[PDB]
Subunit: 114 residues, 4 copies
């Protein structure tokens, strides 16, 4: 199944935050309407926040997270969870290796903001 | 029901990261084994990361998030989600007012690290 | 925070299914647009499926679950999770006593159908 | 990433329930310790329950859901959600075709029971 693709309400502000947990340099690209809107890179085995940003879902509401290491796309796992019918998290894990910890880059999208 | 309380595997590193979305300064306490292990304070209406840290679950595995604003405990909402039977997210939202956006302080706990 | 309330897409079929795990007789009411649309009852300590039904979310998409035992409202916990940006589960747990297993009545709402 | 695999505590009673939403006849196998512990089949486009059972996680704690149609394994999606640090849901969706609704067989695993 496709992973790392989320439909937000249109014209909604959201946060996106990436964490790194690998010997490999993570490249995290965040697309909105199929266009890169944020990019983060870094290497950490201590959960560094390699980037955080605030974006708007725009007219399409389409948000995609891609994770690659040195040009190689990592395997993605994702889901969306909603608490009290209001608070939204879109979650991504990624595996760049063989150990299957799926934490090599971890991306969390949150909304609403404000 | 109790919210903001999570049982992690014992003696395991985990990340904890807080965001603010409120006109009021947020005070986030992270307890491990019923004792303060980290404290974050900050103010934003645009999802600023007011703190991030790496902690150890220690012998109890017991992690509790509390959020207070001007000394009043905020109402919490929480859950844990596990992806590919491996990647763990413990999620917290908080409400300090009347609008019920539950994003006033948003707390994400992630494990494993590394 | 409010629990057991979910906004579904409007005018969409969904499944609602209740399970019992208590010595108490569970009564589960499912409201659509603030009116009772389904009522399930039963007693089991072995996860009986006391009811399952297909409903339509109607014009508001508002679905609410309430649980009671002998007229006493149970305390509810809930969340929604979405898999591969398509497959939706709205989940309810309920507590009628003092052990805090929150499984006394368990309700699962699923969509899409078909 | 692997999907439909869950680690339960050892020797834990759990509910598993399956629904069908396809023209294809679903076969759902639930493995415990890599051995078939329950098999369900049915066909519905209206979310009919095609199986429900109570099983034991046994010494391994290893639970796997497999879905096939006409001898062909369906593509799975899965996640685990924990409410109030106590109530567990292990959720499975499956796709047997080309529409990507991932509801062809929907499987819910819940614990604790009792
Ligand atoms: C921007 C909005 O900020 C709201 N919070 C408050 O308004 C708040 C936090 C503390 C206080 C506060 C303290 C002391 C005296 C007073 C009364 N003047 C008030 O107000 C959020 O709930 C909302 O979702 C929005 O993000
Ligand atoms: C420290 C360990 O790092 C592993 N990743 C690596 O070892 C790794 C992955 C991709 C790479 N591309 C270039 C060098 C390189 C190295 C991770 O997959 C593993 O989970 C763990 O975090
Ligand atoms: C077997 C146990 O049953 C408990 N519930 C009860 O024993 C219970 C709760 C409410 C009641 N109202 C009238 C009779 C009655 C009995 C549950 O709360 C507990 O989790 C466990 O399932
Ligand atoms: C009614 C529709 O049925 C679809 N499935 C099928 O039409 C389907 C899938 C696999 C099959 N193998 C043999 C016959 C056969 C038929 C489903 O994939 C689709 O989502 C929808 O529920
Ligand atoms: Ca890895
Ligand atoms: Ca790693
Ligand atoms: Ca608020
Ligand atoms: Ca707010
Ligand atoms: Ca109980
Ligand atoms: Ca019970
Ligand atoms: Ca299908
Ligand atoms: Ca289908």
């Amino acid at each position: 199944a496709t992973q790392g693709v989320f439909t937000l309400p249109a014209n909604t502000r959201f946060g996106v935050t990436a964490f790194a947990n690998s010997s490999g340099t993570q490249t995290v690209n965040v697309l909105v309407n199929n266009e890169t809107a944020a990019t983060f890179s870094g290497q950490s085995t201590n959960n560094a926040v390699i980037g955080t940003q605030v974006l708007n879902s725009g007219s399409s509401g389409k948000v995609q997270v891609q994770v690659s290491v040195n040009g190689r796309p990592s395997d993605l796992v994702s889901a969306q969870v909603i608490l009290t019918n209001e608070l939204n998290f879109a979650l991504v894990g990624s595996e760049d290796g063989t150990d299957n910890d799926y934490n090599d880059a971890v991306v969390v999208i949150n909304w609403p903001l404000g």
